[PDB]
Amino acid sequence: TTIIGVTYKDGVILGADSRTSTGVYVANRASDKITQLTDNVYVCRSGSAADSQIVSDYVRYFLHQHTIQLGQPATVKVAANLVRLLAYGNKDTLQTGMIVGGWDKYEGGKIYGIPLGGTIIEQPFSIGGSGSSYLYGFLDQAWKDGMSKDEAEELVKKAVSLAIARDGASGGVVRTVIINEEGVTRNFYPGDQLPLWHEELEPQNSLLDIWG
Amino acid sequence: GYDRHITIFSPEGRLFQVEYAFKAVKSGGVTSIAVRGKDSVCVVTQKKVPDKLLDQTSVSHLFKITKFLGLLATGMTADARNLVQQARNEAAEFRHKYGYEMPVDALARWIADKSQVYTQHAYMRPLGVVAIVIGIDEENGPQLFKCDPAGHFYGHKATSAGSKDQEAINFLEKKMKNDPAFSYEETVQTAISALQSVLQEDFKATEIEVGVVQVANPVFRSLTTEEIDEHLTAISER
Amino acid sequence: SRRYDSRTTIFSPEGRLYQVEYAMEAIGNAGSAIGILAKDGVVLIGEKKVTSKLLQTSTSTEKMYKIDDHVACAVAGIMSDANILINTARVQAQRYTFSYQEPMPVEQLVQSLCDTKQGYTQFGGLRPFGVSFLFAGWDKNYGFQLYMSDPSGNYGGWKATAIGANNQAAQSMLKQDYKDDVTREDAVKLALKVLSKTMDSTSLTSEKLELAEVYLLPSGKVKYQVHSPESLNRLLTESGLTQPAAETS
Amino acid sequence: SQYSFSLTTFSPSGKLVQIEHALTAVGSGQTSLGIKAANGVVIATEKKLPSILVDEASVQKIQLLTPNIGVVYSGMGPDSRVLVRKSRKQAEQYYKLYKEPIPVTQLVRETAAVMQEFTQSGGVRPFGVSLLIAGFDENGPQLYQVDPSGSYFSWKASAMGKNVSNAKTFLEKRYTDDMELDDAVHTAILTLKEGFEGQISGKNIEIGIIGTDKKFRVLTPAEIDDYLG
Amino acid sequence: TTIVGLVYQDGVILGADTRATEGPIVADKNCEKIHYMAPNIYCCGAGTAADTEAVTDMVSSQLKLHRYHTGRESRVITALTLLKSHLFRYQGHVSAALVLGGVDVSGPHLHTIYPHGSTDTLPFATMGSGSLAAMSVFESKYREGLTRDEGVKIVCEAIASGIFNDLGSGSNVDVCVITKGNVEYLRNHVQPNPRTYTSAKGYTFSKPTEVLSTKVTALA
Amino acid sequence: MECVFGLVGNGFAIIAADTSAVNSILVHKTNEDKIMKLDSHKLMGASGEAGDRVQFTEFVQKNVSLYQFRNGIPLTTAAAANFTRGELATALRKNPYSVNIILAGFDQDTGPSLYFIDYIATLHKVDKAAFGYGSYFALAMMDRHYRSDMSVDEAIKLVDECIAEIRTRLVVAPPNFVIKIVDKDGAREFAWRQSI
Amino acid sequence: SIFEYNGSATVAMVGKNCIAIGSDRRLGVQLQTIATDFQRIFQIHDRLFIGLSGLGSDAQTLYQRLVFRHKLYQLREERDMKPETFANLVSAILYEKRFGPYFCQPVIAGLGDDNKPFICTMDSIGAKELAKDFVVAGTASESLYGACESMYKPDMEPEELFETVSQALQASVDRDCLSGWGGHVYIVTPTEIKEHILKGRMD
Amino acid sequence: TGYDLSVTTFSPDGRVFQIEYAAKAVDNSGTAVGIKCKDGIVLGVEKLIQSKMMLPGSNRRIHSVHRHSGMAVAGLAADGRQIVARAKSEATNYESVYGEAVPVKELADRVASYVHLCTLYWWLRPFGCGVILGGYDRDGPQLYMVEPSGISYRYFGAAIGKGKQAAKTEIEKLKLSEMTCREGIIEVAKIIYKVHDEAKDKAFELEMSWICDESKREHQKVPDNLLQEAKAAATAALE
């Protein structure tokens, strides 16, 4: 698994990898690891599938209640703190690591990384899932604060594809979710659209097209 | 005996406390009406501030139970807020537990069932609030419903609540004898007009509040005072 | 909230509980039923109070219920509460047969039910059950037994007793006519006679009656059985013929 | 929360007064009736609404609890909903435990016990409703009645609500065994017409019928009008 | 076991074999592995049987009660969410795992539910021991917009692959076709491996089978 | 560790048991009588953890006595055995007692009976029973010489033989056994088998 | 394990309009043979029998508890419970203890409806195995499966059914050391119930 | 006539008399004024000295609820403390769960819901106190007032107790949109002094708390110097 969140001038561009595995078998190739909490806040689910899914459901429920009570678009900070309410409340049972991103008139686009165990860390970007480790070195020399929706999109695609190419637990299509003042924009990048990194070849239908 | 004081059957079979709750609704001076159209549902009531001090935006009887459900509460304001909190808790719980938006008829039925409880348990005074629920059912089209302190939810094509029940009903069914199919603008203007014909006075589009739904825009919405004023002008010139 | 409390469980200045006495009155207003403890069995007969002609009557019983393979009861009073009490009584009998693996002796079943009733009679502030039971059954301990339960939660064994409407007249005729060694047929005849003589209407109608008898089959098996309407017709005709067969002189 | 003081005590005459008030309260409810043909059952009630503006289609008085069973109420509407909900719950518990439909008699007994509960428990009033539960099952057609006292009976035909006595006598004189289901439907419609002030129409009354071995179905106005035509 | 789910152009097709085993011995040659939940929802159960029938039956009853309460036809998301809420709170101890399918106001639906409450939404799903044998066929032959006959062909091929290639599942193939209105269920659509021997002359029980006592009852 | 065994004659049901109470290696006592009297017409030999044996046996005797006085008619042997089994089986999954029980009794209308009740709460109406390491020798010898119509002389001879073998062949051979008989007259002590 | 603490062998097999249910006859601590006349088959009503293989104590408890529920059903409904319904009841009351299970492997067999046989055995937590040719449970599971698979026929008169179930049970129990010491076979027909006790190897 | 004896009993007029008796208890208490200035909120309370030996500062009636808001209670003070405690509880609980300071509007809504709930129960005495919240949110200053019946609305000025009518009339004669909280101090002091009537009641001590921008949006007492000069000005304003 891989989940990355990038903050650009206007908002967030949360990301994912799409591969729920049960051992060495790939039970699902197009899992959706980014879920909605409100129209402006999304969480990158990672870790245990059941635990992350239900924490997403419960946060969405509490956050519906909250946004009706206030009659007002719920903020990112509150979404992250609600995710922590359950991540920390259930340290024993929930083996989940998540990244929460969104947009507000109050504070703009913010990313809150709730790692395993239940801390909240506002960050310029976050990395999670088992595929994170292949990225620390790359991101540290890549992150430039204040990017556009474009450069941030390319960087998220590069990060998730580099993690995909090298990690057993991460693969499939790259999914990204651009959250902004105008609203969420969900994308889908199969392997064919992603670049080709060290010692990888261009996909070809059949060897009969080259011979050997 | 005690039956005048608590919700137990009177010697002739009436529950007097529920009746007194109805009287409490008709108290308070306010009256409200709703008109279900072909394409929309409009719900309208009158609000009035006696003081310069009281902020006018803090007083209103339209409540957004859900982005796609509304509710107009007639009765005691505190009870109206209690019932509103209960319904908001139910709507969110229904969507959570069952995975889809709660339909209007379900909200009305749940409110009515909750109200029935006060009517059977002796030491729980029935809520003195008649609540009108509007929403556009995803499959049944526009909906309108009315729940009373007794607990008799029934679905109404058009209805009234408050101190002027009968006058509003008579005007509405006079204007609706033909079983019409009201356009949006026609629906909302019929509601406003039936309020006018009950108050016997004009109103500056400020002492009135309107809430509407539309199939083209299911969100329960409260009209801008300028839209209310445009509807007033349209009523004037015909 | 205090002022709304009737204080059901409380002693009157006379030293007696009012609600239970009102319960006995409610029994007195209910349909009559009597029991005959015969040598070879026990017979319960009951009066169906509601006798509109549109009633179906295809249901086997309205006042007598089976509580176990060896015990049955005839109910008088508020049948609504009697349903609950019979449900409990069946449950208690099965609880004994589970714990000990054998039929629950009748006297114990009666006593457990009466202990249920006395609870409402003594604490909690709920109205007592307005019911009264006649129990018929058989044990290895004592053989055929007949018991009567007051809504006070009190009970006693009776060779022949009656409950419900017009109780005391039937009681008196049972005093005058019941004898030891009354067999199956004699018990049935005596019950029919005493009831009809206690009924407002002679030449009774099978649709307005119920007769049940807990006897012992030749092979030591307690067989409870409630007579079908045609069997009631046969007995009614035989009794309406035998009554003049004695009154002729 | 003591609320443990029976508000339905025994009057000095032995009568349970509050239950009697409940029986009157149903006595002032809209009429309903039911007949059992030799090969099916029929229940109907009057559904006259205070105004045309009330959408009659948004609520039904005849409701089916299990595909075999349906009920009609007279008296307070809100209480009938409580009882229908609880009876449906019990039917589904029975089906969970035994994978069979609950027999009509058992459902009636359980609903009656629910009725009785409120006539002994403290802090509550008995239900101002009486039910006609029509069902057809493995041992023939059945029509059961339930009243706020919690007692239940099996009727060949019955009625309750406004205009009980006239409908009752009408049924008693006009009922007969071997009546077919359609004859019963016509008879029920006629009985409603007897006391029904105004003129009957498919949008004024409600009818439900169980055929032979089939499911309880509530007639739609499009076809009730055909029956009454 | 081998259970399968495919969403074709009009609706969702479910499939399953009919072998049930208890260790290395087949207890039941013809098991009913596709279950009814609602007029438009069926589910193939894999994992611990007792748990699968218990949970599917409980959800079926809840869904029927909700159908009465709201009147309108139940939808699949409701079944999915009820199954999630039940399975999770038992933390996977109840080891029921299902493929769930139906057709609703929103159109065909197909989900896989795992004992911990993790769910997926998929165009093709497989579970049970032969899940790999089936997913071979799906990853080779699935495509969008299969017609009902092609879709049923593919599901039958997948189940046959999961019969012949995996020992846990065998016997006969069953299928449930869930279109908009009608659910065409097949009790034993494909019986691909008949009994190979006749046994010729039946064998005789030489030992007369001595018996000591015989109580006999004249049942009515 | 305890040894217990039973035997049903023509009109009597004998129960014998070792009378040694121990801790680890010390016979704190050799007069520990373990066969209880539930009634005038019942015996209940028990084997198992001494504390559990005593507590469970006393509990069952309490319930038997409560039934007797309340109704006026004593529990029949089969009902006493079934009640014991029910209580033991219910405790099995909640706070198990580690007692094995052999219940004998006489009822005028049924005759002598001997019930097998295991600490797992399996109940069976056995002709002959035995618990503990002496069970093997007791059962084999009874099978070898048992008949269905034994005079109390023959039954006691058989029990003496079983005791002698149990002493001779076990390593934990207890020296002292008590023999109790139930007949029409009532549960009783027959004889004490002093060895030391 | 705990299932073979006592050891049992129970079989059920379907004839034309008759049903036959068989069983072993011995109680044992593990290998001690306390009693050669144990009962694993219980009649609940004419045309319905339950065999309860597995732990003996769990078996007795479930039998007594089932009698409680069945009698109370007869008093409340006035009909003897139909086989499939009884199997569902047993499944429910076994699954209630999903996490505390009874160690029984019940076999349920009985005629009903229009004189139509019914057989099913269940997991220890109620997973039913509604079958139509035959059902087998106990420690001799595999041996019974082989014996019945090799000895069954589709539609069998009562006498053929008796002989076949008897031979299957005996030949399958002779290959098991925790079971034997006789046999106890019922042939249930819509007009007659024959309860046979068989001569077995007492070793 | 028997109907005025419980909170779960509508009188045939469809009104609950117990709530009105509670509200009367407030009407008998003492004035409490709140004002929504351009740059904050000023709360002021006429506090009556029961005996001259009380210590100036005794039984303070203006309480904080959380960092950015505070209350003034009129009516039965013992109930005012319970409501203040509940407001504190709600503020901190929301802060905990959502990680954000409670919107004063939400705080007032929760407090009002609590007050209303304390009437639905047959076994509770309805609170006999009315309160005023004046938090200074991220949505700006905003003054609320909760009535012993559970109703509440957002005001620009408020008053409760003996001096209801005079206080309201005087407030209306003020251009709240133009006065800074420094001007609000003077205005509220002057109003409280006008509305007091020495000819009827004993002396009193003005107690005022500003939730303004000088107070860094944090509810605090008015500084002693400004309060005393406002007292002197208000005294001078009586002639």
UniProtKB/Swiss-Prot annotation, chain H:
Family: Belongs to the peptidase T1A family.
Domain of life: Eukaryota
Disulfide bonds: none
InterPro entries: Ntn_hydrolases_N (IPR029055), Proteasome_alpha (IPR050115), Proteasome_alpha-type (IPR023332), Proteasome_asu_N (IPR000426), Proteasome_sua/b (IPR001353)
Subunit organization: The 26S proteasome consists of a 20S proteasome core and two 19S regulatory subunits. The 20S proteasome core is composed of 28 subunits that are arranged in four stacked rings, resulting in a barrel-shaped structure. The two end rings are each formed by seven alpha subunits, and the two central rings are each formed by seven beta subunits. The catalytic chamber with the active sites is on the inside of the barrel.
Entry GO terms, CC: cytoplasm; nucleus; proteasome core complex, alpha-subunit complex
Localization (cell): Cytoplasm; Nucleus
GO biological process: proteasome-mediated ubiquitin-dependent protein catabolic process
The gene coding this protein: PAG1
Stored SMART domains: Proteasome_A_N
Cross-referenced Pfam families: Proteasome, Proteasome_A_N
Protein name: Proteasome subunit alpha type-3
Functional note: The proteasome is a multicatalytic proteinase complex which is characterized by its ability to cleave peptides with Arg, Phe, Tyr, Leu, and Glu adjacent to the leaving group at neutral or slightly basic pH. The proteasome has an ATP-dependent proteolytic activity.
